[PDB]
Amino acid sequence: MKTTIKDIKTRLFKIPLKDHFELITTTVTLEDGSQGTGYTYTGGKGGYSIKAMLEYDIQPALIGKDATQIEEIYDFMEWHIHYVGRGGISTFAMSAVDIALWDLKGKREGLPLWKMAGGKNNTCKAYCGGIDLQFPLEKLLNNICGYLESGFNAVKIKIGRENMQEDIDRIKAVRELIGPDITFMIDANYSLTVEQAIKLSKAVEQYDITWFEEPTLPDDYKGFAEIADNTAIPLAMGENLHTIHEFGYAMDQAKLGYCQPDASNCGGITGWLKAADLITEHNIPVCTHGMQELHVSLVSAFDTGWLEVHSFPIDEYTKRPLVVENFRAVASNEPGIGVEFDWDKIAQYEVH
Amino acid sequence: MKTTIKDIKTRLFKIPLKEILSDAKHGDHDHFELITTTVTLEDGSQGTGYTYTGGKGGYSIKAMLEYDIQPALIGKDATQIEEIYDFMEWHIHYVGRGGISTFAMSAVDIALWDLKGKREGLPLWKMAGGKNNTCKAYCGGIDLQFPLEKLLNNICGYLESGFNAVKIKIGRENMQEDIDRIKAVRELIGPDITFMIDANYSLTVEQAIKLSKAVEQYDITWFEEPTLPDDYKGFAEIADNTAIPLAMGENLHTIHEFGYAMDQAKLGYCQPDASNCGGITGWLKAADLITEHNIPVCTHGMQELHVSLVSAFDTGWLEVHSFPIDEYTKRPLVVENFRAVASNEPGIGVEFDWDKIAQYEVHHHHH
Ligand SMILES: [Mg+2]
Ligand SMILES: [Mg+2]
């Protein structure tokens, strides 16, 4: 059958940073020879685990099937590895496959992802964050000036030192530099307690902080609600939510103002849409985490939230690095997911 | 340090099953998968823990252990099982919060507890709570495709094996079939045998209600995973409209997820599985939580390790799973007057017959 899945190949790359992040490619070949690649990525752990799952648990089960029936295959995968699923490694792996199918669906239908995911805009608000917690203060600000002159009107910094006061300092430093008009967000990486967080959001309400990202453990939905009810800075989370249920819980109880689903680990573009469709119902901004190359097509598709521009140069090893027109990420009109890996450049980082 | 971690060796086994086992959502089952993890110290000390699966995930569990966790563990004090376990959570967090990650963590932590026992010279049931060395138990079968005669004969075997409680799978497209097979099992075992059911998260809320209603008359001790274990509210709705107590737990991989259950699911019985919710340390954290909500601490799979744990808390039941891990152990499960007998050797009470399972080792290989 024309669209029947004939082969699937999955490669793992260790790519250096500035220490290193993982990239997992997954290429689906069809009957008529059409190809499509999807991917997922990591901050350094579980690359092998993801590739093992794909290569033993999921891929051989997928050979034979019709690549056009993507919801079907998605659903099938979720039940197939359920015992060792319900999030974790299993969802990275699922994403990689689902994205490649979306890619074939794009090339097949001659449509770019931004129109495929709903097509409400081809451009979107963006903002830069860094792996900046350990950074000396002057080093941080010189970095942020960099972002502002590259063409971005919003920045973000990590907070969460045992020395709380050092954090309120760095937040005030950045607001001085950027002035009234540039947007400011903070991300705590679930290092705070509820009461620790409430301390900090109270201490910096004055700096027009646009959101407080993952203030406490993301598994603490009541926690967030306790925070938000003692706080006037909008709460944000999503990175680490891997299941449409986990997003369900977040809307139901977490009282969030901004939600950031990551297509690479909440089950690809099918899952991401599940999440974004949900978030929209709750009249909340649809934002994203990591994977700028892909997500620009997705944020722009719902036109409502921020595209996070992450440190990982995943886009530096593709054909089209993120494109900015005045303070806005621009999405590719090329059919597919609008991402296409520079195979020759990453080939040196492939592993095993 | 004399109990620093030296080398940690992890093995995969694809162990076949005497026959094909089916249930409502996992399809078929011709083998299960075993993962063994041996932690060695600076004084020759050797502890070994394990986890299992229904045939999927083994390579993925070995991979995670071999690259992401094992190297980061070497040169820590095996005594600090609290610290090493707290460490593993944050270490793989980005690709964690359950799923493959907690299987991984469980094998390692159970090793550390096998060391803590051998080093302290204590049996698990004392370590895990002490409150008893024997415990109630029931036989589960992954038996949904077995025609009615085979299911009954097979059940006739569980009674004759010295057991006073049994469970059967339900989840057929035709609800009537499941009703007629429950009615049958009750008619075969008489009033005195405890009887449970298990639908493997295969029903809609409406279906679980209709089903539970049409069979409450057969004195069903609990109703295991009627619906998705992520639909806590779903569990609420079912419990609010039916009499037979609800049970879940075997798919909950996080202390938070058990929290959600106790908070919302309105469960009568909960079933932590040490193999996949953070080993013995996590199991206790969850058993403790299950206890404070005045719910009987039961158990899923891995009969030879849990017999210690259900005994130790002495409030719930021990499942005699259909993956006969204990048969490739040196000590098969021991039943005395319808009760499970916890091992008294120091450690976890489990020591595999490496010679027997040796023929079943798998090894990665190359694509
Ligand atoms: Mg964050
Ligand atoms: Mg069950």
B48: CATH: 3.30.390.10
The residue of chain A nearest to residue B65, with distances taken between CA atoms, is: A49
Does B177 share its domain with B306?
yes
The answer to whether A54 and A40 are in contact (CB under 8 A) is no
Rounded Cα gap, residues A315 and A290, in angstroms: 10
- Angle A89-109/B100-120 helices, nearest 10 degrees? 170
DSSP string, A39-73: EEEESSSSHHHHHHIIIIIIHHHHTTSBTT-HHHH
Rounded Cα gap, residues A281 and B83, in angstroms: 42
Q: Is A245 on the interface with B (CB under 8 A)?
A: yes
Rounded Cα gap, residues B267 and B295, in angstroms: 8
Does A124 share its domain with A16?
no
The answer to whether B38 and B74 are in contact (CB under 8 A) is no
CA angle at B266 for the pair B261 and B269, rounded to the nearest 5°: 80
Does A322 share its domain with A194?
yes
Strand partners for B14: B33
Rounded Cα gap, residues B284 and B267, in angstroms: 18
Do the Cβ atoms of A56 and B54 come within 8 Å?
no
Q: Is B250 annotated as a binding residue?
A: yes
Give the closest of A52, A86, A249 to B99, CB-based: A86
Q: Which residues of chain A lie closer than 8 angstroms to B366, CB-CB?
A: 352
Does A75 share its domain with A131?
no
Strand partners for B143: B22
DSSP string, B322-366: SS-GGGGBSS---EETTEEE---SSSSS--B-HHHHGGGB-----
The answer to whether B247 and B222 are in contact (CB under 8 A) is yes
The answer to whether A21 and A312 are in contact (CB under 8 A) is yes
Q: Whose CA is closest to B142, among B25, B314, B237? A: B25
SS3 A81: coil
Residue identified by tokens 């760095």 is A170
- B273-276: long-range contacts (C-beta < 8 A, 24 or more apart)? B273/B249, B273/B299, B273/B300, B273/B301, B273/B302, B273/B306, B274/B106, B274/B110, B274/B302, B274/B305, B274/B306, B274/B309, B275/B50, B275/B51, B275/B52, B275/B103, B275/B106, B275/B301, B275/B302, B275/B305, B276/B51, B276/B102, B276/B103, B276/B106
Rounded Cα gap, residues B46 and B41, in angstroms: 7
Q: In Å, how far are A236, B81, B213 from A185, measured between CA atoms?
A: 10, 38, 53
Rounded Cα gap, residues A93 and A265, in angstroms: 8
Q: Whose CA is closest to A261, among A253, B170, A280, A252? A: A280
SS3 B8: strand
* Structure tokens, A232: 């006037």
Please pick, among A115, A156, A158, A242, the residue that the annotation labels catalytic: A158
Q: In Å, how far are B211, B221, B229, B267, B297 from B236, measured between CA atoms?
A: 16, 18, 11, 8, 19
CB crowding B26-48: b at 16 or more within 10 Å, else e: beebebbbbbbbbbbbeeebebb
Rounded Cα gap, residues A275 and A277, in angstroms: 6
Is A80 known to be catalytic? no
* Structure tokens, B222: 């609990």
Residue B170 Cα to ligand 2 midpoint, Å, equals: 10
Do the Cβ atoms of A51 and B63 come within 8 Å?
yes
Does A261 share its domain with A324?
yes
Residue type, B68: D
Q: In Å, how far are A101, A218, A243 from A250, measured between CA atoms?
A: 28, 9, 11
Q: Distance from CA of residue A297 to its chain's centroid? A: 12
The answer to whether B21 and B67 are in contact (CB under 8 A) is no
- The burial of B197, by beta-carbon neighbours within 10 Å (0-12 exposed, 13-18 middle, 19 or more buried), is given as buried
Q: Distance from CA of residue A325 to its chain's centroid? A: 21
CA count, 13 A, side-chain hemisphere, A141 = 13
Do the Cβ atoms of B95 and A50 come within 8 Å?
yes
Ligand nearest to the CA of A130: 1
* Structure tokens, A96: 């990689």
Does B338 share its domain with B366?
no
Q: Whose CA is closest to A80, among B26, B194, B209? A: B26
Q: Whose CA is closest to B273, among B228, B323, B223? A: B323
Strand partners for A27: A9, A37
Does A219 share its domain with A70?
no
Q: Whose CA is closest to A161, among A141, A129, A123, A132? A: A132
Q: Distance from CA of residue B174 to its chain's centroid? A: 29
The answer to whether A271 and A263 are in contact (CB under 8 A) is yes
Q: Is B132 on the interface with A (CB under 8 A)?
A: no
Does A179 share its domain with A243?
yes
* Nearest CA-CA distance, residue A182 and chain B, Å: 30
* Nearest CA-CA distance, residue A234 and chain B, Å: 24
Q: Whose CA is closest to B40, among B6, B80, B91? A: B6
Structure obtained using:
X-ray
- Across the A/B interface, how many CB contacts are shorter than 8 Å? 119
Rounded Cα gap, residues A146 and A126, in angstroms: 15
Element (H, E) at A286: none
Q: Is B300 on the interface with A (CB under 8 A)?
A: no
End-to-end CA distance of chain A: 33
Cα dihedral B15, B18, B23, B27, rounded to 10, equals 60
Is B169 known to be catalytic? yes
Alpha helices in A304-346 (DSSP H): 343-346
A213: CATH: 3.20.20.120
* Structure tokens, A233: 């800075």
CB count within 10 Å of CB A351 equals 12
Q: What is the number of domains present in chain B?
A: 2
Pairing mode, strands B134-140 and B165-169: parallel
DSSP label at residue A198: H
Ligand nearest to the CA of A288: 1
CA angle at A240 for the pair A239 and A241, rounded to the nearest 5°: 100
Do the Cβ atoms of B60 and A79 come within 8 Å?
no
Q: Is B173 annotated as a binding residue?
A: no
Q: Is B89 on the interface with A (CB under 8 A)?
A: no
Do the Cβ atoms of A86 and B53 come within 8 Å?
no
Neighbouring residues of B99: CB distance < 8 A, sequence distance ≥ 6: A84, A85, A86, A87, A88, A89, A90, A91, A242, B253
Q: Whose CA is closest to B295, among B325, B319, B320, B265? A: B265
Q: Is B367 on the interface with A (CB under 8 A)?
A: yes
Does A161 share its domain with A295?
yes
- The burial of B116, by beta-carbon neighbours within 10 Å (0-12 exposed, 13-18 middle, 19 or more buried), is given as buried
Pairing mode, strands B134-140 and B317-320: parallel
Do the Cβ atoms of B63 and A48 come within 8 Å?
yes
Q: In Å, how far are A185, A200, A295, A306, A330 from A126, measured between CA atoms?
A: 12, 25, 11, 5, 10
End-to-end CA distance of chain B: 41
Q: Whose CA is closest to A291, among A318, A319, A310? A: A310
* Structure tokens, A15: 């790519």
Does B134 share its domain with B9?
no
List, as ranges, residues 257-286 from A with C-beta within 8 Å of B: 265
Does B100 share its domain with B128?
no
Residue A238 Cα to ligand 1 midpoint, Å, equals: 8
CA angle at B351 for the pair B346 and B354, rounded to the nearest 5°: 155
Q: Which residues of chain B lie closer than 8 angstroms to A249, CB-CB?
A: 260
CA angle at A126 for the pair A123 and A127, rounded to the nearest 5°: 175
Overall residue count recorded for chain A in this entry? 352
Q: Which residues of chain A lie closer than 8 angstroms to B264, CB-CB?
A: none
Does B17 share its domain with B153?
no
| Helices and strands: H and E segment counts in chain B | 13, 12
Q: In Å, how far are A293, B41, B69, B72 from B1, measured between CA atoms?
A: 48, 9, 20, 17
Residue B229 Cα to ligand 2 midpoint, Å, equals: 10
Rounded Cα gap, residues B191 and A304, in angstroms: 62
Q: Is B213 on the interface with A (CB under 8 A)?
A: no
In 3-state terms, chain A is what percent helix, strand and coil (to 5)? 40, 20, 35
The answer to whether A67 and A30 are in contact (CB under 8 A) is yes
* Structure tokens, B336: 């005395």
Resolution (A): 2.5
* Structure tokens, A318: 């593709």
Rounded Cα gap, residues B312 and B310, in angstroms: 5
List, as ranges, residues 52-81 from B with C-beta within 8 Å of A: 53-54, 56-64, 66-68
Q: Which residues of chain B lie closer than 8 angstroms to A217, CB-CB?
A: 256
Residue A131 belongs to what domain range?
A: 111-342
* Structure tokens, B241: 């409209």
CB count within 10 Å of CB B161 equals 11
Rounded Cα gap, residues A341 and A318, in angstroms: 4
Do the Cβ atoms of B99 and A82 come within 8 Å?
no
Do the Cβ atoms of A83 and B231 come within 8 Å?
no
